[PDB]
Write a protein that holds these residues in place. Structure first.
Motif, mmCIF file in Angstrom:
data_model
loop_
_atom_site.group_PDB
_atom_site.id
_atom_site.type_symbol
_atom_site.label_atom_id
_atom_site.label_comp_id
_atom_site.label_asym_id
_atom_site.label_seq_id
_atom_site.Cartn_x
_atom_site.Cartn_y
_atom_site.Cartn_z
ATOM 1 N N UNK A 197 0.844 -1.226 -0.068
ATOM 2 C CA UNK A 197 0.118 0.157 0.120
ATOM 3 C C UNK A 197 0.789 1.558 0.041
ATOM 4 N N UNK A 198 2.030 1.193 -0.058
ATOM 5 C CA UNK A 198 2.996 2.417 -0.163
ATOM 6 C C UNK A 198 3.011 2.859 -1.713
ATOM 7 N N UNK A 199 2.450 2.012 -2.494
ATOM 8 C CA UNK A 199 2.198 2.487 -4.018
ATOM 9 C C UNK A 199 1.199 3.508 -4.158
ATOM 10 N N UNK A 200 0.035 3.534 -3.199
ATOM 11 C CA UNK A 200 -0.785 4.735 -3.404
ATOM 12 C C UNK A 200 -0.294 5.856 -2.895
ATOM 13 N N UNK A 201 0.752 6.092 -2.715
ATOM 14 C CA UNK A 201 1.609 7.374 -2.297
ATOM 15 C C UNK A 201 1.582 8.115 -3.457
ATOM 16 N N UNK A 242 5.267 13.759 3.827
ATOM 17 C CA UNK A 242 4.916 13.949 2.855
ATOM 18 C C UNK A 242 4.116 15.416 3.212
ATOM 19 N N UNK A 243 3.411 15.521 4.267
ATOM 20 C CA UNK A 243 2.699 16.660 4.576
ATOM 21 C C UNK A 243 3.842 17.838 4.759
ATOM 22 N N UNK A 303 -4.921 12.192 10.096
ATOM 23 C CA UNK A 303 -5.367 11.128 9.873
ATOM 24 C C UNK A 303 -4.146 9.714 10.010
ATOM 25 N N UNK A 304 -2.710 10.338 9.893
ATOM 26 C CA UNK A 304 -1.858 9.466 10.310
ATOM 27 C C UNK A 304 -1.227 9.453 11.749
ATOM 28 N N UNK A 310 1.176 5.675 2.319
ATOM 29 C CA UNK A 310 0.674 6.360 1.294
ATOM 30 C C UNK A 310 -0.023 7.565 1.688
ATOM 31 N N UNK A 311 -0.196 8.059 2.916
ATOM 32 C CA UNK A 311 -0.576 9.124 3.367
ATOM 33 C C UNK A 311 0.475 10.691 3.387
ATOM 34 N N UNK A 312 1.637 10.007 2.968
ATOM 35 C CA UNK A 312 2.599 10.913 2.716
ATOM 36 C C UNK A 312 2.189 11.497 1.446
#
Lengths: 177, 72, 106, 74, 74, 74, 74, 74, 74, 74, 74, 63
Positions: free
Chosen positions: F15-19, J20-21, J63-64, H17-19
């Motif tokens: 699920x890192x691919x959804x970054x 990422x944020x 959310x993280x 992926x939240x990054x």
């Protein structure tokens, strides 16, 4: 798409039909220019002809090797064969270089062209060399500019133009070389 | 209404903007050189819109201090 | 329109800019400028000069398998449709300053 | 049974190098659309620079797909 | 089952090449919106350049979808 | 149950691919704001370019999400 | 034989150096397309700098795959 | 509890992926500020493209936040 | 031989430093193409900064495999 | 304990999403400085777009943080 | 001898920081070529900011190398 | 060892900031000493994160 080739030699074909033959063909401003943009040349090495213009005075028509123009995204230098560029200039210092010496005209705006045949053209409205400018009158007018606040944004379109012109003029002489 | 640069969104044309920057450079020159400024700064002409061949009266510009920086 | 008294004191660029500003009230696709070009003290060639409006006709009449103006890199603030609007108003005001100065010497 | 197990963990971590050619080709083909819009006269000549740069960047992607095949089937 | 557990931790690490492909494709499709705002005249010629690159940048995505099928189902 | 234990560390690491599909759609929808600010008359067209780019970049995000039920639910 | 097991996951975790190289090639090959679109009269000299740049940024890719051949086959 | 222990490490790795959506909505709201400075007369129109893209980029931020609920609790 | 096995995964994770030096080298050689397109007259001076940049950007890439050769052969 | 031990790396690998944020907020706050350098009259309107966008990027960052609060403290 | 094993797997993971500072030096030296092609009359001056920016960014390249020798030799 | 990947980004961020020092001084060379006054302020207030990352390295190795 080029199905409508308007031009000076193509103005004469319709002019020989409706307009009478009593008059000679009217002249065009292209007939007075010895230099164009699409026919390449005029570089022959490390030099390129620079035409620096006001409406009231031809300031330079010689050949230089470095021209520094104050574009609206900042200063940039023009070497012998620069990329073809239509660069709008802000208030700043147009700096010419033919060699070891440099002349620093402060301009008020107006565009600057670099053409695909290597020629360049600087088109300003008022270009004063910095020896004709005295800094005692400059920020006394900025003191009259950035203090008055009219919410009519036609006047602070002029006042924004007043701020960036005077402030670029202060650093034009305070950052002397 | 329109977009573009800061003068263009105010209704100010480029010719009015670049002349407002032009004479404001001429105002701060040295006095041997500022004497040659209000010569090429003065605007002296008149106009008359012809609606059907009958003008009206006039609109006379007699300004010796440059282009009007006020609204138009 | 009828404009007069342009030679009473002198011809200036700000005077020619306000004359050109009243030609931006109407928004045509061309500006024909009829004047007498000062060839010499004997000869005076009548000269016509046209200024094509940017998004009306100037962008279309430079198309040569693409565009002739696409060779230029715009180094200005906004997009080329605003650079060309500021340039053809400059091109109108420059050649109107020259026209009534060429015609005054003629 | 851990040597055949560690091959399957290896090739999965080996093909993360295919992300960069996935991000590199989007920049190069993104600059193809900006270059063609800037100059439509030479628009398909820039495709001649794109597909040469595509197969020269593909050489990286074939170098990463090789290791996925090499540590499994050699 | 250390061999079959290895293929899920292996192919999980394999498919994160799609992150770089997903980051590249967004640069490429975003570059057309800048390219169409410059040229509205050839705006659908540029759509042929993006869908060319969308076929050719996803090529690596199905090269990375190859690995999750070659680890889990081979 | 090390096979079922490696499912969720596998589908989790898938699920890192959804970054990057988020990082891709950020520069793509950021260029939708940039394109409409430069050419506002064709803003009716540019959203049709972004949503066409939204669907084809998600193709990665549904290629990335088909893995996580091919690990867990297969 | 856990040393041969760590060679596969070692070489798999080594070759992600090709990702930033692959994203590095796409930045340089993207600026080849943009730099040729600005002035195409000097387009063949920019290929002489793109290919000069490509041979020197793959030189990092030379040093990353020799590591993969030094832990595996040495 | 190895099935339960590998839940939380996997569901920890799933929210990286939240990054990417954080890097996506950061550049999207950056190009909203830059886009409004071009022309502020269509600034409220440009937020209509910003929150359209924001709602379509959190579509991955919910697609990645359901998998952390499908690992810990399913 | 877990110590000698850790040299294999240690040198693997150390080589990932060559990814970022390749992405930096592509930006540096990409701006050389953009730099030589703007002024083709001084293109011999700009490679005097690029090769100076090439001598200094891989000056820490040689620091990276120095770490690799110290955890392999020491 | 193997469950309560893996909660820490399950929380530690979960809060990498704050990168990422952090790289997202720098592009958004970087465009506030650039957006005000272009149009400094609407400079306080662009803060109204900045802190609006700052709220909608932190919401993914929060959310993280809720996942590291339920992994450690379900 | 797990501590001497964890001495070296941490050493490879420590020097991943040499990627980003290698990406930092490439962006900065790319901005030297982009800045010297803008106006080359101050090309002598801008190297005095690039080498200033070099020696202040490679401090981080030895700060991670401080960590590498502190888990190798301490 | 896993704590100090975070020095990559602060090394990558300062390349953008010191690169924009060269980019900013090429566009306005007369105020170039003011831009170093903004660079070294931005350098010293980003190196805090370079030691924030080094803080966790020294609290894991020695605490």
């Amino acid at each position: 798409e080029a199905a409508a080739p308007a031009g000076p030699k193509e103005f004469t074909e319709v002019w020989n039909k409706k307009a009478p033959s009593t008059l000679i063909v009217p002249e065009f401003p292209s007939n007075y220019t010895a230099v164009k943009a699409v026919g390449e040349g005029q570089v022959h090495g490390d030099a390129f002809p620079v035409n620096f213009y006001t409406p009231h005075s031809i300031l330079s028509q010689a050949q230089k090797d470095t021209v520094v123009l104050p574009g609206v995204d900042g200063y940039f230098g023009v070497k012998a064969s620069h990329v073809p560029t239509i660069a709008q200039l802000k208030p700043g210092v147009v700096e010419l270089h033919s060699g070891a010496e440099s002349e620093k005209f402060f301009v008020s705006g107006g565009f600057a062209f670099v053409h695909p045949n290597g020629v360049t053209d600087i088109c300003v409205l008022e270009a004063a060399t910095l020896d004709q400018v005295d800094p005692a009158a400059v920020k006394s007018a900025l003191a009259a500019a950035s203090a008055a606040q009219p919410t009519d944004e036609f006047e602070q379109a002029a006042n924004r133009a007043a701020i960036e012109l005077y402030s670029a003029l202060e650093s034009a002489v305070e950052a002397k070389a | 209404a329109p977009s573009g640069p800061f003068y263009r969104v105010a209704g100010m044309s480029y010719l009015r903007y670049s002349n407002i920057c032009a004479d404001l450079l001429r105002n701060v020159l040295k006095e041997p050189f500022k004497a040659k400024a209000q010569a090429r700064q003065a605007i002296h002409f008149r106009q008359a819109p012809y609606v059907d061949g009958k003008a009206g009266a006039s609109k006379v510009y007699e300004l010796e201090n440059g282009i009007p920086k006020t609204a138009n | 329109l009828a404009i007069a008294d342009t030679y009473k004191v002198r011809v200036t660029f700000g005077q020619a800019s306000l004359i050109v500003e009243e030609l931006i009230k109407h928004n045509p696709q061309s500006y024909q400028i009829l004047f007498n070009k000062f060839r010499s003290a004997i000869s005076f060639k009548p000269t016509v000069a046209t200024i094509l409006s940017p998004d009306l006709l100037e962008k279309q009449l430079e198309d040569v398998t693409g565009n002739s103006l696409d060779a230029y890199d715009i180094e200005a603030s906004h997009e080329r449709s605003d650079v060309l609007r500021d340039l053809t108003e400059f091109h109108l005001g420059v050649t109107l300053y020259n026209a009534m100065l060429e015609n005054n010497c003629s | 049974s851990v040597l055949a197990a560690s091959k399957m963990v290896g090739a999965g971590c080996a093909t993360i190098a295919l992300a960069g050619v996935g991000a590199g080709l989007g920049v190069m083909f993104g600059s193809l659309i900006n270059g063609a819009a800037r100059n439509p006269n030479i628009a398909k000549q820039l495709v001649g620079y794109a597909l040469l740069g595509f197969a020269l960047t593909e050489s990286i992607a074939l170098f990463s797909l090789l290791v996925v095949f090499l540590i499994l089937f050699a």
